[PDB]
Amino acid sequence: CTFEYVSFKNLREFVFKNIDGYFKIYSKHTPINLVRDLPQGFSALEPLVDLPIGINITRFQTLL
């Protein structure tokens, strides 16, 4: 508990990385036509969050 913070037609995209104790989240939300694979085309993700976590990460799991 050494840190705490607060703030298929749609595709939600994210990027997560941990560098020098900072955890960076980027994202994009976009409409799509075909859901079976990621849509061929281009649109860059933009930063949301940049947490000073200081924690080691080697595994992750999604929450449904």
Partner: peptide, 22 residues
């Protein structure tokens, strides 16, 4: 003093292994 002790950039690790300072 038993209140103070020691064992990547800005990493922290509270896992355990520790020596208190005298």
């Amino acid at each position: 003093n038993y209140n103070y002790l020691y064992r990547k950039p800005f990493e922290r690790d509270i896992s355990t292994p520790l020596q208190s300072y005298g």
